[PDB]
Amino acid sequence: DIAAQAKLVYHLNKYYNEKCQARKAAIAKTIREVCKVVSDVLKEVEVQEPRFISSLNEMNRYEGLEVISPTEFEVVLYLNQMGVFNFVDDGSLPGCAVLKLSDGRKRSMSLWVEFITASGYLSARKIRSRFQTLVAQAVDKCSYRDVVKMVADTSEVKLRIRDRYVVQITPAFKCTGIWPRSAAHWPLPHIPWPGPNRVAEVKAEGFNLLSKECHESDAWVLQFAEAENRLQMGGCRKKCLSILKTLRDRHLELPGQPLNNYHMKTLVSYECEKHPRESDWDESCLGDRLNGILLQLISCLQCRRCPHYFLPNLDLFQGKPHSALENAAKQTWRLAREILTNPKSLEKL
Ligand SMILES: Nc1ccn([C@@H]2O[C@H](COP(=O)(O)OP(=O)(O)OP(=O)(O)O)[C@@H](O)[C@H]2O)c(=O)n1
């Protein structure tokens, strides 16, 4: 039985060294060709409207870029601001928050003066709509125009590149020096994880406010990309996450798109709360952690509920038909059974 647990760890590491490493290289190649199209479209916007500056810093990754699928991405476009707005998060719009002007006048003081309502709120929808018109003009004018169209029938700004890749470009503001009320419960009082030292840097990472749709209202959607990534450092956590994203790409890309990489990302964080010790994420525990996550994934699909890690009131399955979730449970179960029954199957997965 030690041989079987050891056998699972061995073949998972081969899977990580082979399929996961190839996946990282292939997506990096796709990201490279997709971002130079995005940079050309965005630099066309910025000449027409300098407030939309391209925050595509390669820094060695592209800041603000998130992978959803081997062919789908989201670029977070961070907008300069003066800092005249107050962050307001009551639970009136779950998973959302609002930016209000600090006192009555000084609307002239803001860079986005025309987008502040009479009530004094900075409108996410008005900013995205203006941004959409600018992008729709850029994709007809830029050098790459033959390979970029803009996706239709959506209020989101999405570029379809070479009829293969889809990129959502989401305007956003970075919020530092504040933790949101909707996330103030975290970290849980009892759970040994993370270390209080780790919590203080995660909260120092801040959070983002994104202009996209969710659930009329027009508020900003909360997002914790940078906090999430700092949270999952240490041990084999990220190696586990990479294996999950790879298995999902190759075997759980299903009709209706019930599962995406962010589901895997959320489950790893919850598995960290269920196993808070650093020794639970030792390299020898890689098989136990992956098994626990896959079974946890099956439970979420069967229960029709997969809560957001920082915003437990939010369900990451909301809007997905139960037939698609049930199909994903049946495929995830059969996948987890094959891996556990014979880890050598990973060679051909
Ligand atoms: N902002 C980003 C995100 C991704 N990538 C590239 O795309 C690959 C796949 O990213 P991801 O879906 O997050 O898979 P991971 O296994 O998590 O890659 P990593 O461990 O490097 O984060 C990464 O290896 C990285 O090289 C990038 O260049 N810039």
Author numbering: 1 to 59, 61 to 216, 226 to 359
From the paper:
The male abnormal 21 (MAB21) like proteins form a sequence related subfamily within the large and diverse family of nucleotidyltransferase (NTase) fold proteins. Here, we provide the first crystal structure of a MAB21 protein and the structure of MAB21L1 bound to CTP. MAB21L1 is a two lobed, globular protein of a mixed α/β topology with approximate molecular dimensions of 64 Å × 35 Å × 48 Å. The human MAB21L1 structure exhibits a high degree of structural conservation with cGAS but features a number of differences.
